Structure formats: structure tokens, C-alpha cells
């Protein structure tokens, strides 16, 4: 499966999903992250 980016972490697509890369999710230039688990970060203001 490709991933989906977590719109209730704020994240938003940076990337597409090709044969060689998953999905790459981020944040907007503004924005910080905190990172909740190895995966799993949010965006913040």
C-alpha cells in the first residue's frame, strides 16, 4: 500500500506515491513538527 498523509496530524501531501518511493508528507513552510512516535508527527503553528 501507498500511505496516506494524516489530515488531523495538519499534514499535507509533498509528494506522490511511486513504484520506487512512498508517499512523502509534511508540513507548510511556517509550520514545525512534533514528532508523537518514530512515525507519527504533527504540525504545528
Same mark, same amino acid.
Given at each position: 500500500?501507498?500511505?496516506?498523509?494524516?489530515? &488531523?496530524?495538519?499534514?499535507? &501531501?509533498?509528494?506522490?506515491?511511486?513504484? /520506487?518511493? /512512498?508517499?512523502?508528507?509534511?508540513?507548510?513552510?511556517?509550520?514545525?513538527?512534533?514528532?508523537?512516535? &518514530?512515525?507519527?508527527?504533527?504540525?504545528?503553528?
Amino acid at each position: 500500500s501507498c500511505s496516506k498523509c494524516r489530515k &488531523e496530524m495538519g499534514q499535507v &501531501e509533498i509528494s506522490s506515491c511511486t513504484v /520506487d518511493r /512512498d508517499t512523502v508528507c509534511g508540513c507548510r513552510k511556517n509550520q514545525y513538527r512534533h514528532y508523537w512516535s &518514530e512515525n507519527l508527527f504533527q504540525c504545528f503553528n
